[PDB]
Amino acid sequence: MTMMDMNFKYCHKIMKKHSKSFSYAFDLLPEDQRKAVWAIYAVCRKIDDSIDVYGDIQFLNQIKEDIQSIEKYPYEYHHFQSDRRIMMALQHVAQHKNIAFQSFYNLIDTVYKDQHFTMFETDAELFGYCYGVAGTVGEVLTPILSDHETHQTYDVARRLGESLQLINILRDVGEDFENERIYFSKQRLKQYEVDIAEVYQNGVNNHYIDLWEYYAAIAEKDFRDVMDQIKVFSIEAQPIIELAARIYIEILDEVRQANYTLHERVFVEKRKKAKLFHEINSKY
Numbered sequence: 001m002t003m004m005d006m007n008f009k010y011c012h013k014i015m016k017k018h019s020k021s022f023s024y025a026f027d028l029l030p031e032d033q034r035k036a037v038w039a040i041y042a043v044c045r046k047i048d049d050s051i052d053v054y055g056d057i058q059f060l061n062q063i064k065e066d067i068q069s070i071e072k073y074p075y076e077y078h079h080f081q082s083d084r085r086i087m088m089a090l091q092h093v094a095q096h097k098n099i100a101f102q103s104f105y106n107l108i109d110t111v112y113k114d115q116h117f118t119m120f121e122t123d124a125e126l127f128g129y130c131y132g133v134a135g136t137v138g139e140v141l142t143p144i145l146s147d148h149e150t151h152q153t154y155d156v157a158r159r160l161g162e163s164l165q166l167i168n169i170l171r172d173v174g175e176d177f178e179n180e181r182i183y184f185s186k187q188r189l190k191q192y193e194v195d196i197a198e199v200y201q202n203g204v205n206n207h208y209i210d211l212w213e214y215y216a217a218i219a220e221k222d223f224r225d226v227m228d229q230i231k232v233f234s235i236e237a238q239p240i241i242e243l244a245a246r247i248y249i250e251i252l253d254e255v256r257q258a259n260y261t262l263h264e265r266v267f268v269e270k271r272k273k274a275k276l277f278h279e280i281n282s283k284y
Ligand SMILES: C=CCc1cc(-c2ccccc2)ccc1OCCCNC(C)C
Pocket: 022, 026, 037, 041, 044, 045, 048, 133, 134, 135, 137, 138, 139, 141, 145, 156, 157, 158, 160, 161, 162, 164, 165, 241, 244
C-alpha cells in the first residue's frame, strides 16, 4: 500500500461503517470511481458528526477551510486542519475530477444552521433541508458517476439525494425524536392530527400511518423519477445506482413490516441486498 492507498482505505472504512447499503452497492464500481465515492462520502460523514467533536463549530470550520484550500490550490501541499487522511484523498480526487465545491459549502451551511434547529413550518422547508444534507451530496457525486454531465444529471442526482434523505427520515422517526428532532412539517402534522411525542409514547395509529405514508409516497415517486432517468449516468454506474436506490428504498417496506415502530431501527439484511443485486444484475 502507498500512502495515498492508506487514505482511501480509511475513507472506505468510514463509508462502510456508516452505510452498509451504500457501501454494498458503490463498492461494485470500477476502482477509480469507487475510491472517489469513498472520499466524497467520508468528507460528508465527517461534516455530519463535526459539531459534536467539541460541541461547537470549531471542527466544522477546520473542515470548511480544508475544502476551500483544495478549491483554491488543488495542486499545492496543504497542512490540513481537520481529518488529514480524508482531505488528502479528496484533494487527490479534485486533481482528477471536477468537484462542485459550492455543494460542499451548502452542506456545511445546512449543518451549521441545524445548531439552531426549529421545526419546519412547511414541507418546502423540509425539502430544502433534504437538498442541503443530501441533494448536495448527489451534486458532488454527479461528475464521478457520469461521462458528460448536463443540467439533467444534476437534477436527477439531487432528486435521488432527496429520496434517500426522506427514506432516512422515515426510518429514524423515533431515534430523531429522542434526539430532539422532528422532520415532518408542522403543517402536515397539523393536517394529519399527529403529535410525534404522543406517538412515541403510545404507539402508532391510523393518523400517524397516513402521515408516514404521505411522505413515503413522495420518496417513492422521487425514486421512480430517478429510475426513469437513469441514463444520465455512465453505463457502469447505472446498475450500481439502481442497486443503491433499490436497497435503500426497501427500508420503507421494512418499516411497514415492523408496524412503523418508533423504538427500533429497521434494516435490509445483507441476504436481501444480494437478492436485489441478482434482480438488477439479471436486468442489465
Ligand atoms: C454514496 C451515497 C450517498 C448519496 C448518494 C447519492 C446519489 C446521487 C446520484 C447518483 C448516485 C447516488 C445522493 C445522495 C447521497 O447522500 C445521502 C446522504 C448521505 N449523508 C451521509 C454522508 C451523512
